[PDB]
Amino acid sequence: GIDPFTGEAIAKFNFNGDTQVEMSFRKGERITLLRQVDENWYEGRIPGTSRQGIFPITYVDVIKRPL
Predict the structure, then answer these.
(1) Cα–Cα distance between 23 and 55 in angstroms, integer?
(2) CATH (residue range 1-67)
(3) 15, 21, 36, 64: least CB-packed within 10 angstroms?
(4) What are the Cα distances from residue 54, in Å, to 44, 45, 60?
């Protein structure tokens, strides 16, 4: 999240992805938001993890958003 265009989000609920493309996590995790892909998902990753994917907009609290 060095780059200012990225948004910061926290996990509200424990998300399991059902495809290879979706990123799975526990609640209370700080996810960086890359972009919002549509009405229901963002593309994201976790800081200093290899974990990247898409997740539901619903499971996460967005503080600052992708620009």
Answers:
(1) 6
(2) 2.30.30.40
(3) 21
(4) 6, 8, 12
